[PDB]
Amino acid sequence: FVIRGDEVRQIAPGQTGNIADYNYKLPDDFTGCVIAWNSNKLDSKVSGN
Amino acid sequence: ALGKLQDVVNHNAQALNTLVKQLSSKFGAISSVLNDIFSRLDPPEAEVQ
Numbered sequence: 001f002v003i004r005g006d007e008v009r010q011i012a013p014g015q016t017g018n019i020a021d022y023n024y025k026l027p028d029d030f031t032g033c034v035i036a037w038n039s040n041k042l043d044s045k046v047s048g049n
Numbered sequence: 050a051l052g053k054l055q056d057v058v059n060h061n062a063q064a065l066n067t068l069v070k071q072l073s074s075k076f077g078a079i080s081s082v083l084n085d086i087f088s089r090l091d092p093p094e095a096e097v098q
Contacts, residue, residue: 013093014093
């Protein structure tokens with residue numbers, strides 16, 4: 001998916017916030033990896049996406 | 050005269066009291082209240098505590 005810049009830290013087990021509660025919840029006993037990279041060049045419109 | 054009989058009771062009660070007192074020690078954690086540890090801190094180091 002695509003999220004805001006400061007919300008990338010909300011994608012973690014045990015976190016609290018708007019994204020971690022109403023959009024995507026990670027289990028406490030989570031295993032695996034998360035990969036997040038800036039994509040300002042492909043998901044940005046001057047008029048507004 | 051009955052110190053021999055009294056000492057058994059005095060030892061048992063004192064040991065039980067010592068166990069109850071040891072129940073309320075922080076043991077190196079930030080707090081000795083368990084639900085406080087749950088609520089105040091996130092799971093990552095709450096698990097360690």
